[PDB]
Symmetry: C3
Subunit: 239 residues, 3 copies
């Protein structure tokens, strides 16, 4: 590539145009919360063999993030929404159509899990495997890329703690899952503080201030954080 000028492909041309425009037709800002993933990590380590044996797919952290985010989009319908700046009307989507960022040799794509609110953790794990595979092997259909109401992007896959991901209207939010890192943190029990090692992650949420304010974003991220930290997912694994 070095020392050359080359025309970009259609996917990269559209990405360049849409991201420049997206920032000018929305009011983006990125709120950041930290989440203790230790209990999810222990649950995943304990149940991974039985999960793979019963459902036929590997159990990663992604279905836990997806389950929590989709439940929070149902509980906070104001975030699963779109604003029309010409009519000043807000549309609150009944479907949670979750876009996921996927890496392909031709560029990043955002295929969609339609009606993700009806899916269990085993169904989510299978849908991720299917979308990632077809995205990398050029087997996506136009329906796989349209209708998204919210996006999740795994920025931690290449080592980042956090980012300010660009949302694409008509969506109102895009959540990044940063790298999960062991850190010394403070634990409080019966008013006594102590230092312990925990698996911590940053969850940066880019949100559109036309649709969501700082308090709305914080309540939505708190629902996600508390669901993941409690890690009451054994029943959800359907073992």
């Amino acid at each position: 590539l070095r020392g050359t000028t080359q025309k970009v492909n259609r996917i990269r041309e559209i990405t360049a145009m849409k991201t420049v425009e997206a920032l000018q037709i929305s009011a983006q800002l990125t709120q950041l919360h930290e989440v203790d993933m230790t209990r999810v990590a222990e649950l995943r380590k304990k149940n991974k063999p039985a999960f793979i044996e019963k459902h036929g797919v590997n159990l990663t952290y992604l279905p836990f993030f997806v389950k929590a985010v989709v439940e929070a989009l149902v509980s906070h319908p104001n975030v699963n929404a779109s604003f029309n700046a010409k009519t000043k009307e807000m549309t609150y989507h009944s479907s949670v159509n979750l876009s996921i960022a996927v890496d392909t040799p031709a560029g990043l794509l955002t295929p969609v899990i339609h009606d993700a609110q009806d899916l269990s953790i085993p169904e989510i794990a299978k849908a991720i495997v299917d979308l990632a595979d077809r995205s990398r092997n050029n087997k996506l259909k136009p329906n796989d890329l349209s209708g998204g109401t919210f996006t999740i992007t795994n920025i931690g896959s290449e080592g980042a703690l956090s980012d300010t991901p660009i949302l694409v209207p008509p969506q109102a939010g895009i959540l990044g899952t940063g790298a999960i890192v062991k850190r010394p943190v403070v634990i409080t029990e019966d008013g006594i503080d102590s230092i312990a090692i925990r698996q911590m992650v940053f969850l940066p949420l880019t949100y559109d201030h036309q649709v969501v304010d700082g308090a709305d974003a914080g309540r939505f991220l708190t629902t996600i954080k508390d669901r993941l930290e409690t890690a009451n997912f054994e029943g959800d694994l359907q073992l």
Copy 2:
């Protein structure tokens, strides 16, 4: 429930949507982040809270400490308490510090203003915050309570956030977020010896307009705030 419907938004949401989209296009916003050790303020607040409530008739929270430090820094850094005219290329440095504070209401977030905040003590700030929060919730704010802001503080930690990139509204040049105050293991140095101690740490993200403030100006302004809060010499300021 809201799901499956299309609804016209209220006047606050409509103006907020319009102003925030436009604000980002008539300024050059970026957010610098510093960490501040609030342990000494936390201990001072815990020790003096009963005497403060008894004398001044108001609860002592962290907010008057953040307000007092930010307003002192806006006086010491008049270049931050300022507005830029992009047509004439002139900067106006405001002699008044009119501090806007983000407040929650049933109809949405508002930013009422503490006018001439540079003349106020911590007890006067605590009383002004109680008055503004009460009238904001009970729909008794007047137009003079919402105009003339020269800088804003928003408590993004009230809903759990560590940090954010809050949107600044021109003609203001800065908006400071106060993140959640969290106990963390940190390195302390005493008599040349490093050790690990538990401290109450907060992130202070400052969104600033690069038309008015550069990265070094922002850093010097946040350092004045950080040093004031970390030294926590506020006992005389409490007027007990």
Copy 3:
């Protein structure tokens, strides 16, 4: 004179900075990815070799030549980051030269002088070039060539205490890296499968990048190359002592 209570026209640097930064955000798609880097081994190497470095090369050894050397090597191995996008023709230009801009403080404001063809320079040559550019910036001895042709920028946001920032990128550049404050922190260390807590010098490296040129995965790969180079800290030979 005193600013408070006055209206004053800004100087040329502030006027150009106000125009370029407002416009830059509207002709690019900026976002800032953040990574943490353990600078302890670089700090120890710098402390150990600082006297021999200033004795042989005549200039002080700071952290900046280490950041510059790592960033310039990564700009050569990630040519997609040392690049510019033409939104009219939809063509990407991958620059063969690494012309590294560095933010410098002056009495009149911040400037970004450029180290041209930085890919050919050693750490001693980088250290000498930084001293020269910082001096000529503060004493108004810069020639127009010292401010043009930049392909990437490094800004030391940690010099005034910041952990991180979302620095504004100036097109046609595709990235700007901030070096946050280097702070001692308790971190987890793993040795033979055993975790322990140790004190390490940690730094945040926020990279603002243009999504027209670089995506989140590209940014992460580029920052991982820089992070691994700095954490390994195999720079003794590079110091040419």
